[PDB]
# Entry
Amino acid sequence: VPKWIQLNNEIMIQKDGKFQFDKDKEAVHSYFVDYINQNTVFFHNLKEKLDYLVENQYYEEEFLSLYSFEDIKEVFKTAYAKKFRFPSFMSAFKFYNDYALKTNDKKKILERYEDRISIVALFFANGDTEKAKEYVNLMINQEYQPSTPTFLNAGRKRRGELVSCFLLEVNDSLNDISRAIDISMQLSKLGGGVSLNLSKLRAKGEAIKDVENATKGVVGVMKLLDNAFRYADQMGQRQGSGAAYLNIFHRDINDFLDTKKISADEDVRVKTLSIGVVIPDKFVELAREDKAAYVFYPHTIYKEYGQHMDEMDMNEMYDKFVDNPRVKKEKINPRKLLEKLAMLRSESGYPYIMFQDNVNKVHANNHISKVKFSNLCSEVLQASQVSSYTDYDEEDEIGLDISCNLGSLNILNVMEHKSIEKTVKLATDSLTHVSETTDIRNAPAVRRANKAMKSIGLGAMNLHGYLAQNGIAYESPEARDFANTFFMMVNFYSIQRSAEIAKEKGETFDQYEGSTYATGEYFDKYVSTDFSPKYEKIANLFEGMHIPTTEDWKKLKAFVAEHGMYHSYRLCIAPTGSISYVQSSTASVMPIMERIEERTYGNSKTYYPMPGLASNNWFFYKEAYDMDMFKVVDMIATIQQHIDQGISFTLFLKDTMTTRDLNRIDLYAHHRGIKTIYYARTK
Amino acid sequence: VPKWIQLNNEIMIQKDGKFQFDKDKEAVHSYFVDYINQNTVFFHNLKEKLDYLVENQYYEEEFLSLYSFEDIKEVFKTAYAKKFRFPSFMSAFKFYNDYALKTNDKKKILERYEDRISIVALFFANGDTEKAKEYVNLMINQEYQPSTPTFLNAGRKRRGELVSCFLLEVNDSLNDISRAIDISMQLSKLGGGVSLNLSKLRAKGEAIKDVENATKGVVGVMKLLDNAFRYADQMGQRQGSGAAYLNIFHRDINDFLDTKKISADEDVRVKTLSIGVVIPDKFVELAREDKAAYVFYPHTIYKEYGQHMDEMDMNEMYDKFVDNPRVKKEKINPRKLLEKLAMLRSESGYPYIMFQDNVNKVHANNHISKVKFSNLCSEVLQASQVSSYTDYDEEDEIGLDISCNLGSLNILNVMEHKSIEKTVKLATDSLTHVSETTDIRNAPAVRRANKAMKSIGLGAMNLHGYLAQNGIAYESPEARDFANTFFMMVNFYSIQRSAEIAKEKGETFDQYEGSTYATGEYFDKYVSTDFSPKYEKIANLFEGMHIPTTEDWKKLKAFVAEHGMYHSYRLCIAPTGSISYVQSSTASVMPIMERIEERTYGNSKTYYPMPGLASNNWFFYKEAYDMDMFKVVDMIATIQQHIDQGISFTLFLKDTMTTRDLNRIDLYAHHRGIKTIYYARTK
Amino acid sequence: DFTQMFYNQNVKQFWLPEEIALNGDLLTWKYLGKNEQDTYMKVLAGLTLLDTEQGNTGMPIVAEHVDGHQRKAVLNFMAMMENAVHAKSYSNIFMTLAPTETINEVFEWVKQNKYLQKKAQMIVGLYKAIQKDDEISLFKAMVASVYLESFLFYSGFYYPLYFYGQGKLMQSGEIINLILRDEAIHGVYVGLLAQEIYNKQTEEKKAELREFAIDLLNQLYENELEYTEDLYDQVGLSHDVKKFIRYNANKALMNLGFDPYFEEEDINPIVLNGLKATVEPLKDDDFYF
Amino acid sequence: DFTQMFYNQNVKQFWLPEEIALNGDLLTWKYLGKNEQDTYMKVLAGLTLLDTEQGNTGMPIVAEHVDGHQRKAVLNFMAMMENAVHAKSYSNIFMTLAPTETINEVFEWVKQNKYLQKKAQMIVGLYKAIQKDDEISLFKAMVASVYLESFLFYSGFYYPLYFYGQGKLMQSGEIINLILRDEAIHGVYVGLLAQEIYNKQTEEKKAELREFAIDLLNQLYENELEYTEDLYDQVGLSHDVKKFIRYNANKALMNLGFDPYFEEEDINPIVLNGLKATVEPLKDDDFYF
Ligand SMILES: Nc1ncnc2c1ncn2[C@@H]1O[C@H](COP(=O)(O)OP(=O)(O)OP(=O)(O)O)[C@@H](O)[C@H]1O
Ligand SMILES: Nc1ncnc2c1ncn2[C@@H]1O[C@H](COP(=O)(O)OP(=O)(O)OP(=O)(O)O)[C@@H](O)[C@H]1O
Ligand SMILES: Cc1cn([C@H]2C[C@H](O)[C@@H](COP(=O)(O)OP(=O)(O)OP(=O)(O)O)O2)c(=O)[nH]c1=O
Ligand SMILES: [Mg+2]
Ligand SMILES: [Mg+2]
Ligand SMILES: [Mn+2]
Ligand SMILES: [Mn+2]
Ligand SMILES: [Mn+2]
Ligand SMILES: [Mn+2]
# Structure
């Protein structure tokens, strides 16, 4: 066993009844003085390194050609001047195993952390040396972390796409289904997770040109998509991951759910395609009143009204659907469907739950389209227009397929540096650059939506780490007050940066004029309610930083009205799974699953303590499963009120609790304004 | 139990030690006195019937509008003047259960046999009343039978395409694979059987964008195609049928074959995807000499030579591939592979066997392309060019995808009417009309090849029926003499009609000038070898009909040289599954499987004796399984020497014979010039 | 003199229920009265129970005590057929014809049915009473097994055969005929092993063994009468089934080398109407003609 | 979670000895040296003897103590394959290659052989020690069974696979490959049944069961090394056979849900070429907060 492995395992060997957390630090030293420094490839100077990486097809030469070598040297020197040290063994291990650039045979390390950060910063700046240094300082301080696609692939010749998630709308036609399968394979080839809205597809037993009971429903398309994602599995490196979203009022909703039952037959079971359910407020109202609900056949509704079932408001059209004899429907028990959802989430963690009305009551771009589904991580909530892929030799009507670039603020590092504004603006600029340089030649709706919406996702990580390292319980009202203030600041500065980009470029996102940003409605709660901290401890935490007031929000509203906004969507809180290790941060705004996690790598086992875990903050690092899910819902709703897109909200459940407890948590989330629920992980 | 079913089951009841075959005739009468006439919709006049069928979206207005009502009435009167009577119960049952037009509620019969024949004739003639009457006389004499798609769908508004055999070339790309899946779905939606060539696809463990061990091979593509064919199942009417062809020198050939093993796992086995193997002469030579063979990685060959492995002659390329270090290959035992093929055919009848050099040594259009694969029934053998389907908003390079037009001569009815020439020419004209009226807007290469090649397949059936009713054993040399003469006349008149159509329209098929028809090579064996019958009995059978001599063939060769040939391909012998029942004929040129076949429809049993079966010809109606497969191979080769495309050749084996016997039959078929082997049906 | 031919017969009879598609019975099933469907489900459930215990317990335990690798191979194969093929086939039939709740209910019904519990108690008790190297306890269990194979199954087999003979439920009926074909050879084989042990005894001991066999048969018979009435009275067939089980009791006795015990009767003629490839390598001469 | 899936895989792998014609092996057998023929005979007898224990005791004893009808059926099927298929297949190979007197002598030798006996009796000892209603003793026997199926057979399988990968003794090599494919799935299945028991134990009991498994593996492994040298030194293969034993030991451990014991090694390329939360209804007032 390696020396650093033994040093890391020495953490759990208690001394005087206490964990040896400091041993972890020793491990990193070993991991660098025995493995990383020996396995790294050193050159005489930076010029030889850059030339070797360029000619050997490791780096794209275009982004490096925008800078003179003196500027690149200055950027690299700025990166190395911080003398960044990984405080935990797992941070360095995760970076050098998942994100550091290696040779073709993967026998040596070509990229250090500073090298990777410098390359990403130079790609972000697009020829601006000062901007590149700003990005270097932002990432080496670990205030901002680009998503895994962006951080791993920026400036690389053998790179994939920098966009993490893609959302596709599938129209009710064989041509559209085949095009959706093709685009899903193309985007999984690019490495991104693909989500498909199957609510427009007509249910099982519908007519294909006057021959009835002919359609296979959404389950056949689900099987096709599952095989497509199995085939396109990132060249066999990462399993192809897809998501299917169906409205709960679709007739196939049961069969949909039956794809995830552990007793499902092979002709129905789907195993590589995640499932999500979109629940309008009408379904929750029907379940609450115990009135029997009706699921609908989408094609009959489309024939009668000319629009898809998910294209209009069910809260106002459900009674018209039910009373219409030309609309076909089936009777269901909404409470039984809710119990089935809870049982399925207990068994397998599926489906994702999207509260459609919670998303669309604060959605700023309802004029473009209502949000009808979410992404594979159930945090992207954007307007999408379905595409009409016609026959060959016929022009296709290209719609809008959602796609946003992810980037997370490290809350602990951002607040320690007292740089919410600067970090938010620089992250917005980096995400705007990632969107601008993204061009996908096989997904036309994705390309058009990227060019028009200009949507980005700016997330946050290390919420629980910051709260526990500052002596604040994650479930406490003080923690929710901190989240309210911090994310109001993040939203304020993201809107300010979006408006500044719109002013400097003279262009807004497409159809911005009909948005609530243009009409000023979006700023209502910000121009009437003060989001400054209500607790003295939180206010002290925010000292040295100008917390925006109602007057600052009014000025920002006027600025947006004058100049517009460059981005249709700005903030989305992704799960941030593996890149949180490198940043020494807790995953996303979720509470920690465990204080010390035991992970098996190779034939060895490693223990990763939570960042900053110690004796004095052991009980502030409360495990998520031990927490009240209602207070976690309260925290997520408090954050969500300042996030325009959704938050990947994983439910952390105990084995003792029943499906009724899961249903109660889901209904409280819906009541509190939670937009989406990601996972039901049971301990 | 209905009266006609009792009268049909009375056949097996033996009187005086003989089957009551004549009772079947009585059954037909009952089937018409009790059921057909009662459930047949009658109109006051044909004008009312045509108006009702057109208005209720049963027929098409376009083809009926080309004639005055007097001409349509005259065509219907010509059809009804024959007073055609089905000689067996199963003929009428199959027609009125499969082909007769029924109401939307499927309880009444709108079309009789004469009505359907008249409608198909009017569709064929395209406005010529005399031509329509000629077609009516052809089909009511049952000399020619349009295929199930053409016969069932001609003149019907609610219909699939008139072509059901489609051959697709799949290029080695994700875009091409997705396009192939889409086209397969679209053609299965039209009701056609789709065959895909997977030899150009790179094997498992190949590089994608210079990353190693990334390709899933052809088995993942087969899984995708199997899912696509399961999804597209004719609006839930018939099981989606598809075929995949792989060259035996493709490295995936074992895994390909492993998709049909019973022991194969769920992630390996494809259930609705037929498989065929293309066997070049090089593989047979390697197996014969017991030299170990090599299966090659197609992408390495493409990178080294710039052409696909299946696009070049393996006979001259195999040694260069083996000696090339940059071509990756795996060692195999060709005799072990042959034994595996025989074992798999014994277990499941798969794969289909295509002898590439047997096809291509007589292929007339090798300049366009060599025949690389066959159809789902393993009888279509045509030149195909792969298409380069690029990314979106980029122009695709459309190639040639095979789609031939099926139609079968009834050898008994044709020869008893002494009308080989007239029937062949009229069938060629009808096939040309159906090929010209076919327009598929979702298969670009299929449409392009249909427009360019103008390839049709004119088959024959009732060969064994005709031979048995004339006191000739199917395995006798007299039967092969008759087949030689009859199919040489069929080829002569098909070529004459093709040249006449080319002269009339002033156009040949695309790239005809490079064909062996243009150079006169095709006629070589016809201008030197006399194909007149060598037996007096066969000559007396051909009495009253002019048998083309060598001088006639020289005149035809000169005529083709002067005027060209309209069809790239003219003759292919399809299995003729259900139309053989309606025509009261034995299926294809195959020998009969059973003298009397027992079938179960609903909860009732039915008995179909072979047409013309009696005590006198009971011995001549020898069952296929009791026959020597070498003599069946000899007869099929005798026919194949006059057929430009292949013949659906099913092997009929006993359970006693082993895989050595199957391999011997396959090798004798290869030796005798058999182009394709369809199935290995074990009794 | 016989094991090898039984080995060959058993392995050549190998089958799986999945070979028979069952969706063809859907309509003739739908058309039966509620009484008929109830009796049919219960009949097959009673059969399932018998095969469950014959496969789990009866055949393996007899295999354990019978000497000779070939005899053990036959008995092991028969055991596999009981629980891996026969018992499972009934679930294939149930899953096709019946909704889950009706399936759940019929399996609950076997647990609480007193005649089915009594017959299982008696048969399995004898299996579990076998003592190593004690041929008499083994004989007693083999008699019990023959009575299960050749007598007890038949109150159940009657009904699928009765339908098959009328052209109803013919796919399910095909499965049942395959099961019956197997049990007939199983009963003969175990009968021959029982006779081997019986033939080793003194005349006095033989007289006691006949008493055991006849007493056991009568006890099982009396219970089967009550079971038959309980199932068949609602479909009007109890008297007919009783004649059938007596017929088969005589066949069981004959399998044991004993004289028939019940007088001959006319059985319903409907029920009477209810009754890889070898591989050679390629020679160099097979490539030339 | 797994028994029906294994049922399917087992029954679809069904095969019979008669399917492979053996006589054509004599065309390569005649060209082997005396040491090669001797090693092959001894290896074959070793496999035969061990597989007989598995058919007569190993599989039936586990089927007896495991609860669950579906598990008992799968286990019965596996026992059938040992006794009815594998045992006949080994006999067929022997009868083809050696005369009767040579077969009797090889079995006499291997029956007296110290290394074959040591492992055979160690495994059988654990099967004999299973106690009714004691899951610990059952687990220990399952570990022994997995070690036989997934590990102990492989010092033997090496040689037929070695010939098979070279184009020698192809008919018997095909048979051995089918047998080996059955033993692989047997080992995986019994492994899952052992993990089920293991997972029901306390942490201290788990550590104790791990120590048992590793200790047993060590004893068997050290004897395998001696067994290997005893058979394979005369044909110069022992080094490569030892790598194959360790590789298969690691597979056996993984079947039991344990970590690999031995470092990863490459294998001889010729041999490679041969190879439910509680459902509680919503009570209303759960929709109000
Ligand atoms: N935790 C760590 N994170 C990142 N790099 C590290 C870490 N520990 C060691 N290294 C790398 O290994 C080298 C070993 O030097 P070390 O940290 O022991 O101190 P040093 O030799 O006094 O110099 P310095 O600390 O100034 O780099 C470091 O210079 C650095 O490049
Ligand atoms: N074998 C048969 N094949 C086809 N149609 C039949 C057959 N037998 C009877 N029919 C139909 O039933 C009608 C009654 O025929 P039947 O044998 O009674 O005498 P017919 O002289 O042909 O009668 P009709 O006055 O109808 O012409 C036929 O006209 C035809 O439409
Ligand atoms: C062709 C086909 C379609 N479908 C379903 C899936 C699609 O969502 C739906 C629409 O198919 P379409 O491609 O729209 O078929 P169509 O346009 O010819 O029929 P229509 O005019 O009624 O739109 O039909 C199947 O389930 N199976 C099939 O094989
Ligand atoms: Mg449509
Ligand atoms: Mg390519
Ligand atoms: Mn049984
Ligand atoms: Mn039995
Ligand atoms: Mn075995
Ligand atoms: Mn085994």
About this structure: The interface with chain D takes residues 262-263, 265, 333, 658 of chain B (CB under 8 Å).
